[PDB]
Structure 1
Amino acid sequence: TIFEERHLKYISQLGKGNFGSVELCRYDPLGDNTGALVAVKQLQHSGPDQQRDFQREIQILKALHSDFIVKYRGVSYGPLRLVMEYLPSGCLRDFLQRHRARLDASRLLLYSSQICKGMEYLGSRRCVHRDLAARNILVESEAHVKIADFGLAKLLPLDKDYYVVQSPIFWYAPESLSDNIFSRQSDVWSFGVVLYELFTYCDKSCSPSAEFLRMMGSERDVPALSRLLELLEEGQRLPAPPACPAEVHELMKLCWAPSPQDRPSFSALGPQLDMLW
């Protein structure tokens, strides 16, 4: 739960993100390269707003205990970093592109169901993730995934079901694009895009970005966000991925209901994904 900084041996960057970075370190108290590998997060920017954002991420993660959520290990003490478990398989986005040929629909439905049970748990703790995407989901093993990257996560006050607040715009809900409103229902919208990513095996050529920019075309002077929003308000959606089982695509469309109230809950989605297998 307390890691001495002098015992955290740097290996490489996993990071690939703004404001903060995640490094692969070996917790090597014996100094012989035999200790367990850990994923260590730190904020590259200092100040009295980023440090508040960093303490909040620590507090949120420390209090989360689920098989489908990256495990908190502790914090570091030195002459402050967040210490979590390291998943050598890495993000689901890259895993799906490397192992495409052996991952069938039942396997993708198993990952979908696991992500869903993780989000149900997040909702129960009043946590809005705000950054649900395949790049933020980690592969624990062949048949097990976990939700990671809690850098944008916010706790919903007891008397509110939403929150009013830089990621690719193709994962946001219309209400987040228009009024910066975030809730468990906008995490459901994002989940719909995760199902799309999974059933495309995160192929870059039919990625939410490639497919939406292709559909948006090119507006005369209208900004791209406004364009995406006009496309979404019009009822236009990402097309069924190639060879996608029809029922999966119907589930995506429900996650993509225009109004937050009409979107299914994670609790409602779970049995539906389990039934499909």
Structure 2
Amino acid sequence: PTIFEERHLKYISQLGKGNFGSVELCRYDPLGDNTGALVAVKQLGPDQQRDFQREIQILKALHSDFIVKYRGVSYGPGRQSLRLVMEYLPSGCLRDFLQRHRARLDASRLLLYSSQICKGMEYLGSRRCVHRDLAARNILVESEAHVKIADFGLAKLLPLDKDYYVVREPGQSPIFWYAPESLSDNIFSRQSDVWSFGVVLYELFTYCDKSCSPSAEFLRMMDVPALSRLLELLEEGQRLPAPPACPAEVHELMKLCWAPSPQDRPSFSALGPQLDMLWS
């Protein structure tokens, strides 16, 4: 079941490109008659090949309604799985779903999305997994009221005696989703995933509008390099403003996810009942 034959994997479209690899829309068509199920296939480098096998084993060990379903692999020279096969969600990434259907998604609908992302993250933390690229662009839409965490290319497992990990090479994702410890020291933990969540929370309560986006807004508040400016601003006490018509209660939780000390930050298991008291 988990061994999908590449010959039966028929190319449809490019789903995306991010963090060295690419995701393609394929049809797993063993009958060769265009009736088979659609699946999302990821493919990629020496440390890149160790990082693909890392992504595969992590996702394969993840079993949640709020994490993209792993379907299996399409093997190659090894021991070395040529490609990773995931479930396909035709609604796609939450960022463009938000933009496409905003006139229809209200506060209640956004809190349910928040609480679902939250339980997914609480689960990932339980597996000792730190996502490191939690953004609305990396959240998928299963149905109108069901979202899932995706893109585990930069995900890492935490050692049993360690609750944080330091990355050698700099960040390549948009800088605005990182915590001040990730920016200044490349330190990552479930606490740096919590900072990122409050940014996802900001994203939901803007419907990912490009004009007031995390990138567009720092651009206004900001010779000094653009990374050191955000470091300067965040350490001083500056934060993204309350999104247009955002409830005062949702915004306060955003600023707590944005506590400057990472130990002070609320956990995901702590975030959930608070998002669940605001209903849906």
The answer to whether TM tops 0.5 is yes
Cα shift at 1:243: 0.2
Do the aligned partners of 1:163 and 1:182 also contact (CA within 8 Å) in 2? yes
Q: 1:120 matched to which residue of 2?
A: 122
SS in 2 for 1:14: strand
Cα shift at 1:107: 0.2
Does residue 7 (structure 1) correspond to residue 8 (structure 2)? The answer is: yes
Do the aligned partners of 2:42 and 2:85 also contact (CA within 8 Å) in 1? yes
Cα shift at 1:77: 3.1
Which 4+ residue blocks in structure 1 deviate beyond 2 angstroms? Answer: none
Do the aligned partners of 1:136 and 1:149 also contact (CA within 8 Å) in 2? yes
Do the aligned partners of 1:127 and 1:153 also contact (CA within 8 Å) in 2? yes
> TM-score scaled to structure 1, two decimals?
0.96
Alpha-carbon distance between aligned partners in 1 of 2:87 and 2:19, rounded to the nearest angstrom: 21
Cα shift at 1:16: 2.6
SS in 2 for 1:16: strand
Determine what percentage of the aligned residue pairs are the same residue: 100
Cα shift at 1:170: 0.3
Alignment deviations for residues 125-179 of structure 1 (CA, whole Å, 9 cap, x no partner): 0000000000000000001000000000000000000000100000000000000
Alpha-carbon distance between aligned partners in 2 of 1:200 and 1:185, rounded to the nearest angstrom: 23
Alpha-carbon distance between aligned partners in 2 of 1:27 and 1:50, rounded to the nearest angstrom: 26
Do the aligned partners of 2:19 and 2:153 also contact (CA within 8 Å) in 1? no
Do the aligned partners of 2:19 and 2:154 also contact (CA within 8 Å) in 1? no
Does residue 178 (structure 1) correspond to residue 160 (structure 2)? The answer is: no
What does residue range 46-65 of structure 1 map to in structure 2 within 5 Å?
A: 47-65=45-63
Structure 2 gap segments, 5+ residues each: none
Do the aligned partners of 1:4 and 1:78 also contact (CA within 8 Å) in 2? no
Cα shift at 1:17: 1.6
Do the aligned partners of 1:6 and 1:78 also contact (CA within 8 Å) in 2? no
Do the aligned partners of 1:54 and 1:151 also contact (CA within 8 Å) in 2? yes
What does residue range 81-230 of structure 1 map to in structure 2 within 5 Å?
A: 81-165=83-167, 166-216=172-222, 221-230=223-232
Alpha-carbon distance between aligned partners in 1 of 2:216 and 2:63, rounded to the nearest angstrom: 36
Do the aligned partners of 2:134 and 2:197 also contact (CA within 8 Å) in 1? yes
Structure 1 gap segments, 5+ residues each: none
> TM-score scaled to structure 2, two decimals?
0.95
Alpha-carbon distance between aligned partners in 1 of 2:264 and 2:257, rounded to the nearest angstrom: 9
Cα shift at 1:78: 5.7
Aligned length: 270
Alpha-carbon distance between aligned partners in 1 of 2:218 and 2:65, rounded to the nearest angstrom: 33
Cα shift at 1:15: 1.7
What does residue range 191-270 of structure 1 map to in structure 2 within 5 Å?
A: 191-216=197-222, 221-270=223-272
Alpha-carbon distance between aligned partners in 1 of 2:144 and 2:250, rounded to the nearest angstrom: 21
Do the aligned partners of 1:15 and 1:22 also contact (CA within 8 Å) in 2? yes
Alpha-carbon distance between aligned partners in 2 of 1:85 and 1:154, rounded to the nearest angstrom: 22
SS in 2 for 1:3: coil
Alpha-carbon distance between aligned partners in 1 of 2:162 and 2:276, rounded to the nearest angstrom: 30
Alignment deviations for residues 93-138 of structure 1 (CA, whole Å, 9 cap, x no partner): 0000000011000000000000000000000000000000000000
Cα shift at 1:48: 2.4
SS in 2 for 1:182: strand
Cα shift at 1:198: 0.1
SS in 2 for 1:15: strand
Do the aligned partners of 1:5 and 1:78 also contact (CA within 8 Å) in 2? no
Alpha-carbon distance between aligned partners in 2 of 1:197 and 1:263, rounded to the nearest angstrom: 19
Do the aligned partners of 1:21 and 1:42 also contact (CA within 8 Å) in 2? yes
Do the aligned partners of 2:115 and 2:275 also contact (CA within 8 Å) in 1? yes
